[PDB]
Design a protein around this nucleic acid. Structure first.
Ligand code: K
Ligand code: K
Ligand code: K
Ligand code: MG
Ligand code: MG
Ligand code: MG
Ligand code: MG
Ligand code: MG
Ligand code: MG
Ligand code: MG
Ligand code: MG
Lengths: 88, 224, 253, 372, 254, 260
RNA sequence: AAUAUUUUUGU
RNA sequence: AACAAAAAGGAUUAGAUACCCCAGUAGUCUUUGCAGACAAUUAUGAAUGCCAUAGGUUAGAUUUUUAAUUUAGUCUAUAAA
């Protein structure tokens, strides 16, 4: 097995999405509600505890945005040193 | 051509001509820059001229078309082979810290290896054994192994006394009312506790996390 | 026999091979990252790096000291340029000794080729042989254009090539510390040495700083004997001729 | 003939750095981790220090000054330089306390290193004129080869099938000519025996007939033959017909340069109580409980087997800081691979309470308050 | 480096020699740290006290006093070694040698060669030269050591003036015709070495320097030439008296 | 490397007339001190203490249990010179301020004379007898006597190796034994745990050693001999030492506040 | 991840 | 067998021969001949001498086989040009 190559000269060494993309949590609770209706039924009693969780999710306040990641800044410091150089 | 035309070596030749005559024909040339006369007799050195570098080892005589004739060669001494043999037989001798920061460079002026391993300015380490071995092997005409044994046993008798002093020096101090601080053995254990505790927090958190994955595999949302 | 802050409190007049070696002035860059152009100052290869010859570093350092000394002996304006995290105390100390200018931050591109704009509002002053100011050049200090260093001493030529290019473009001599990976054609007087070490740069700056000091001493000591080692620059010279022209009108009229 | 500049570099301190020795030998036919590596058995790079006045500036006598973030603040300044200048134009370094203090811990136990013993304890020192010897002469027979520790030939039982092939073909096969001469020198001595003995009451021996015929007489007795081949290649004896060659000779000095003490036959005189019975105990961690058919414990940075007997039976998350038990280090030795194996033996009760008296942890002090 | 230097045609020879002097001092690796001045201090004083006469009989007589145990010079070992070498050389050359050392202080550079030619022309006819050369180079010391015509200086009576015929040019040997007429009494440019007594004297007689302040005056003018501090200090240890204390320094001759 | 330094008033060549012959001062300082420095140099040959002062090594290696041996040489080379330095070539008249202050802490000069001398013999071991200057934040400048063992530092920063009481004949079963035993354990436990037993002002200004007395065997075993029959010995050595105390310097190093 | 309706022209 | 020019049908579309779809013959494969055109490309004929480095990679060789030298290829990024 070969080792990682030395990247060619790039314009900028960065990652597109530095900070991960947060997924809406309530979308996962809805999927569980739609699962009950599929198996149990719509006007049933088994989806009671699950439907309530969906109402409580949309009522709760969404979290706060996390501090941005500083990965792209450090990648720009060591670009010319890690890669073959900068191109433009 | 990403480079630029640098004429730093001809600043005098260029400045000397621009100051020889005047742009306004019919007038004497004005005084030249104050630096034109300072470096009048200090020309630059020749740069960008690949010479035959110093050969620190006999070059391959059998090569008919040798390459890398303008490549600096590696500096290898007879001690390099002795250092590797010693430090490999004494790997933990590398744990003993050694300072490679010189004070004034005049350390090899007081080193007389005909006296013994203990010299002025340098610590008793694997180098003193190597320098002592090389001396006996060359001057006294001893073999690599013979000189190695002699210089190696003198090293042990000096290290043994060092370890005996630490034990007795402490025991002797307590016999007259001398107390000390936390030994390295105790401090080392306390640090492991703080780290082990942090690992316990990480284990219980992940363990509980995996339980959700095991329960989320199957579906029980109907609440039958 | 060694104090960290010894190259500033009392730098040496001349650096020997022991001082340069103790200051790690021979540690070149990795063999892979080299400029074969400056293969003339390399002694060999050890620990994966190129070892610069201790004799080549001393001979080139003694030559630059003779350059910094004479330029100061002829009333020249020197500039010590070191732009690195910890090179500020070194450059400032060298300037004090040599009575020169210091620079420890990013050189603004165009401060020599475009000096009229950059150094526009910076004040100047006219001094006589004994460096004491002269009165009567008020009108000349308003139309005069800014100055340029008669000699630049860069402690890290690999970093700031915009400064060294303006010097070659403006016919200004330069002194630089050429590391194994630096292009030696960027300065006029090279000093093959390790520029990444904060201990080797303080030694070189001290030597060059003492050279300027010893040069200014001779210049001023000669002025007390009525022996000026320099003549009025061309810029100030032209102003004198215009002064006589305007003064001639007063005589006639 | 060397220039003055080249003479100072030879004696400089940075030129004295020893080459990076190969890592501690591991199993060739096994799996390992690539993206993560833990501490090694024994150190491979030299640990460096600097003056406290130079540490505030990052000057460690290297190519460039190191950063002050990960270099200042600690008590013991230690660092290892893997590359003085890498392709990133930075000194690739790392903290060296992992092995620098582990040596200071072991040396704080005040125990020597003794030759391994097969299972009447006989703790013999390692540094002795009879055993600790590397130089030899062609006169020493097999009876003296058991003392040596540094052999030139490899251990056959340890080499792999491929490493053995390379040895037979590229080191053994191109030696028949020189070995035949080795037999002649022996045959030349045998002929001198009868002559000498008969005179009290040498022949050149260059003859292919005797050599070729001399080897045909030993085919029935292959034992005496092996002793002759090993002497020509300097192989470590394997068959008893002895020098603890079951696992093979050591890849380094029997002590590995970790502790230069020769004997543990001393009695630390306690200030008040007086000369103690055994050495002071040492607290040890508990790793990998039995419930693996053996328990591991951390004694002064090293991992060794637990005493031959709770804390060892089952894991207890409630115990803060982990299970810690006092124990006495009985014997310490260096195996063939270079590991430092400790014969950790259970400690007594009075010793532990006595060791705590000077610490302030003993619940009831033994002095004064103790009525019986 | 000497090739890179390109002087201007209008530069005087003084400028050319100064540019080459500063170029040689750049390749100086420094004198040894342990080796001390051999001819300095005691041995240097003895040379000036035993070689100031005009007769070899007095020179050897003075050396015998130094070699005699109990003398205050301290060169007993050196004086003894010097005598063992003086009694092993042709006594005729010693007389002729010392004779021209006193006369050579007034000859010109060109007059020297002309006199040396007429002088060396008579040595070919002498018996010592043809004997010493054959007995030391051709024979390589064989047949014992050289045997000069006069056994030793003791044979030469005091009234003898053998050092008088080698200084009379004969008409048979034509006068040496040099390639040019240039000449001078003192060297025009010979002040690039270390400072000798002449330089230290000129400084003391034209200044008010002290013991330590005088040594520094030379380290500056000579641009810190290696060995100036050790050479100047030696001169100030043989011909420098602390008369007025640390305020000033004077010479011993007075 | 640490190198020997000449003595105060040429005691090496001539030595004190009525206290120590030149041959004794030769073996006491020029030979022994050289021996200690030779050992000290080898210990700090490649450590941070290669350029540090003896006192700086004394305070830096006071509590370190692994550098106890380095403390001995550094503390011994310091106390040894501290003793010879205070000796005067000829008798010196005690200063008025110093004389008046001594009476306030010891009652009379003769009381302090017999205390230090008596403490030396009563110790029956090598060490140093000090005249310390105790000054608390609010208390006046009070003097006292402190007796150190083989190599003990009177400075407060080196309280870890004061070595005042012998743990062999001072810790038993008697009432005084138990009391002394508790202190020996209270210090060790506190010192190990890091707790401070007695508060101390910053900068180590509480105690300032003024005078010292070297009672080691090598100092007097040659001049005054063993001392069989009362003639000479350690007792006479201490007595004769009282006649060569540079009270002038002792007064200066005291730096007594103006209270007269 | 493997998704795919159509959509011409401009002195 | 499968795929699929042709022929043929179903849709899409303003129209749809088409793109998509249901099916589908030559042909693709084997053997013996003809045929000689290709973006038959590295848009670069073949060959010899010569010019400074670095990072990978392929098949070997040597060694203090750990890791560095070295021969013949190939591929990225550069210096002088
Ligand atoms: K189909
Ligand atoms: K065809
Ligand atoms: K390649
Ligand atoms: Mg650099
Ligand atoms: Mg159109
Ligand atoms: Mg259709
Ligand atoms: Mg086909
Ligand atoms: Mg094709
Ligand atoms: Mg063709
Ligand atoms: Mg390919
Ligand atoms: Mg390319």
């Amino acid at each position: 097995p070969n080792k990682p190559i030395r990247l060619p000269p790039l314009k900028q060494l960065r990652v597109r999405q530095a900070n991960k993309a947060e997924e809406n949590p309530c979308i996962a609770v809805m999927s569980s509600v739609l699962a009950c209706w599929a198996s149990a039924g719509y006007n049933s009693a088994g989806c009671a505890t699950v439907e309530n969780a969906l109402r409580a999710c949309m009522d709760a306040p969404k979290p706060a945005p996390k501090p941005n990641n500083t990965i792209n800044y450090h990648l720009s410091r060591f670009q010319e040193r890690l890669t073959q150089g900068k191109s433009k | 051509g990403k480079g630029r035309i640098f004429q730093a070596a001809k600043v005098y030749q260029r400045a000397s001509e621009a100051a020889a005559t005047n742009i306004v024909s019919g007038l004497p040339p004005r005084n030249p820059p104050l630096w034109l006369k300072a470096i009048e007799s200090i020309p630059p050195a020749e740069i960008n001229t690949r010479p035959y570098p110093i050969q620190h080892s006999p070059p391959n005589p059998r090569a008919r078309k040798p390459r890398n004739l303008f490549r600096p060669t590696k500096i290898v001494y007879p001690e390099d082979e002795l250092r590797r043999d010693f430090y490999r037989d004494h790997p933990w001798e590398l744990a003993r810290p050694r300072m490679i920061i010189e004070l004034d460079g005049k350390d090899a002026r007081f080193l007389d290896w005909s006296k013994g391993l203990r010299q002025r300015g340098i610590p008793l380490s694997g180098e003193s054994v190597v320098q002592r071995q090389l001396w006996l092997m060359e001057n006294q005409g001893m073999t690599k192994q013979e000189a190695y044994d002699k210089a190696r046993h003198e090293f042990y008798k000096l290290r043994q006394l060092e370890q005996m002093e630490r034990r007795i020096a402490v025991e002797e101090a307590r016999m007259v009312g001398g107390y000390f601080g936390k030994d390295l053995l105790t401090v080392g254990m306390e640090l492991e506790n703080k780290t082990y505790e942090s690992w316990k927090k990480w284990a219980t958190t992940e363990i509980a996390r995996q339980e959700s994955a095991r329960a989320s595999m199957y579906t029980n949302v109907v609440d039958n | 026999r060694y104090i960290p802050e010894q190259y500033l409190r009392n730098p040496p007049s001349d650096a020997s091979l022991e001082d340069l070696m103790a200051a790690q002035a021979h540690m070149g860059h990795n063999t892979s990252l080299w400029n074969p152009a400056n293969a003339r100052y390399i002694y060999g290869v050890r620990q994966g790096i190129h070892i610069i010859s201790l004799e080549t570093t001393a001979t080139h350092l003694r030559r630059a000291a003779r350059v910094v000394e004479e330029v100061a002996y002829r009333g020249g304006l020197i500039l010590f340029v070191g732009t690195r995290p910890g090179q500020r105390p070194i450059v400032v100390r060298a300037a004090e000794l040599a009575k020169a200018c210091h620079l420890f931050t990013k050189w603004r591109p165009g401060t020599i080729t475009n000096r009229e704009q950059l150094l526009g509002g910076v004040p100047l002053t006219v001094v006589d042989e004994l460096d004491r100011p002269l009165s009567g050049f008020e009108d000349h200090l308003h139309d005069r254009r800014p100055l340029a260093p008669d000699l630049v001493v860069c402690l890290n030529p690999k970093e700031n090539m915009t400064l060294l290019y303006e010097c070659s473009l403006a016919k200004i001599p330069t002194i630089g510390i050429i590391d194994t990976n630096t292009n030696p054609s960027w300065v006029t007087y090279q000093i093959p040495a390790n520029d990444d070490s904060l201990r080797a740069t303080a030694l070189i700056s001290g030597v060059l700083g003492r050279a300027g000091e010893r040069g200014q001493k001779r210049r001023l000591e000669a002025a007390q004997r009525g022996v000026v080692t320099w003549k009025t620059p061309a810029d100030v010279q032209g102003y004198f001729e215009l002064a006589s022209a305007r003064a001639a009108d007063a005589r006639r009229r | 003939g060397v220039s003055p500049g080249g003479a100072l570099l030879r004696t400089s301190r940075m030129f004295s750095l020893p080459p990076v020795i190969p890592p501690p030998p591991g199993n060739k036919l096994q799996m390992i981790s690539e993206r993560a590596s833990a501490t090694e058995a024994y150190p491979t790079h030299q640990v460096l220090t600097t003056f406290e006045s130079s540490r505030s500036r990052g000057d460690w006598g290297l190519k460039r000054p190191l950063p002050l973030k990960s270099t200042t603040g600690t008590t013991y300044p230690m660092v290892k330089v893997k590359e003085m200048d890498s392709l990133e134009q930075i000194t690739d370094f790392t903290s060296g306390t992992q092995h620098g203090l582990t040596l200071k811990k072991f040396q704080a136990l005040n125990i020597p290193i003794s030759t391994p013993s097969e299972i009447r304890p006989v703790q013999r020192s390692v540094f002795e004129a009879d055993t600790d010897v590397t130089a030899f002469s062609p006169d020493e027979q097999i009876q003296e080869a058991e003392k040596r520790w540094k052999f030139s030939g490899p251990w056959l039982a340890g080499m792999t099938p491929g490493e053995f092939k390379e040895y037979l073909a590229k080191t053994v096969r191109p030696k028949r000519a020189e070995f035949r001469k080795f037999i002649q020198k022996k045959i030349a001595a045998q002929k001198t025996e009868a002559a000498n003995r008969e005179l009290q009451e040498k022949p050149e021996s260059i003859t292919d007939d005797e050599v070729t015929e001399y080897l045909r007489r030993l085919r029935n007795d292959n034992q005496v033959l092996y002793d002759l081949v090993g002497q020509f290649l300097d192989l470590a004896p394997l068959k008893p017909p002895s020098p603890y060659g079951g696992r093979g000779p050591p890849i380094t000095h029997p002590s590995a340069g970790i502790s230069y003490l020769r004997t543990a036959a001393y009695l630390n005189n306690h200030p008040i109580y007086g000369p103690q019975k055994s050495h002071p105990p040492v607290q040890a961690r508990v790793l990998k409980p039995r419930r693996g058919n053996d328990a591991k414990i951390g004694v002064a940075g090293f991992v060794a087997d637990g005493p031959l007997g709770s804390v060892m039976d089952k894991f207890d998350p409630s115990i803060e800081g982990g299970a810690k038990l006092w124990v006495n280090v009985d014997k310490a030795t260096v195996d063939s691979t270079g590991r430092v194996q400790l014969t950790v033996s259970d400690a007594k009760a009075t010793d532990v309470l006595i060791a705590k008296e000077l610490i302030g942890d003993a619940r009831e002090p033994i002095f004064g308050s103790a009525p019986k | 480096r000497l090739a890179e230097l390109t002087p201007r045609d209008y530069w005087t020879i003084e400028q050319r020699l100064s540019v080459i002097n500063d170029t040689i001092e750049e390749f100086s690796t420094g004198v040894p740290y342990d080796e001390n001045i051999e001819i300095g201090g005691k041995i240097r004083l003895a040379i000036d006290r035993c070689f100031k006469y005009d007769k070899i009989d007095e020179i050897i007589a003075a050396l015998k006093e130094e070699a005699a145990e109990g003398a205050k010079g301290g060169v007993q070992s050196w004086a003894k070694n010097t005598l063992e070498e003086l009694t092993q050389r042709s006594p005729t050359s010693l007389h002729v040698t010392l004779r021209q050392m006193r006369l050579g202080k007034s000859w010109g550079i060109a007059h020297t060669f002309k006199r040396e030619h007429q002088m060396a022309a008579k040595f070919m006819k002498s018996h010592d030269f043809n004997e010493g050369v054959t007995a030391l180079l051709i024979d390589k010391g064989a047949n014992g050591p050289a045997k000069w015509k006069p056994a030793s200086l003791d044979e030469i009576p005091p009234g003898a003036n053998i050092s008088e015929d080698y200084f009379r040019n004969d008409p048979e040997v034509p006068v040496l015709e040099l390639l040019n007429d240039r000449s001078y009494m003192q060297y025009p440019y010979n002040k690039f070495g270390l400072p000798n007594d002449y330089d230290v004297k000129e400084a003391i007689e034209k200044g008010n320097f002290t013991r330590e302040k005088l040594i520094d005056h030379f380290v500056e003018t000579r641009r810190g030439k290696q060995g100036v501090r050790e050479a100047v200090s030696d001169v100030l240890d043989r011909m420098a008296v602390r008369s007025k204390g640390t305020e000033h320094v004077q010479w011993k001759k007075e | 490397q640490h190198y020997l330094m000449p003595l105060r008033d040429n005691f090496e060549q001539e030595g004190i007339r009525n206290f120590l012959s030149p041959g004794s001062v030769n073996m006491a300082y020029t030979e022994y001190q050289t021996f200690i420095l030779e050992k000290l140099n080898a210990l700090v040959v490649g450590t941070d203490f290669e350029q540090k002062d003896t006192k700086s090594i004394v305070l830096a290696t006071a509590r370190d249990p692994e550098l106890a041996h380095v403390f001995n040489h550094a503390s011994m080379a310091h106390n040894n010179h501290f003793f010879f330095d205070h000796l005067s070539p000829v008798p010196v008249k005690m200063g008025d301020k110093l004389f008046y202050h001594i009476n306030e802490n010891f009652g009379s000069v003769d009381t302090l004379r017999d205390e230090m001398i008596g403490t030396a013999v009563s110790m029956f071991g090598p060490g140093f007898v000090w005249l310390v200057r105790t000054q608390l934040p609010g208390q006046p400048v009070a003097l006292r006597v402190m007796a150190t063992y083989l190599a003990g530092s009177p400075y407060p920063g080196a309280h870890w190796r004061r070595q005042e009481m012998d743990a062999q004949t001072s810790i038993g079963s008697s009432p005084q034994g138990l009391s002394n035993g508790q202190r020996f354990f209270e210090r060790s436990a506190a010192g190990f745990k890091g707790n401070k037993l007695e508060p101390t002002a910053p900068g180590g200004t509480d105690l300032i050693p003024i005078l010292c007395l070297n009672t080691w065997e090598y100092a007097w075993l040659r001049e005054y001999g063993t001392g069989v029959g009362g003639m000479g010995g350690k007792l006479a050595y201490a007595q004769s030492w009282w006649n060569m105390i540079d009270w002038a310097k002792v007064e200066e190093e005291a730096r007594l506040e103006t209270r007269i």
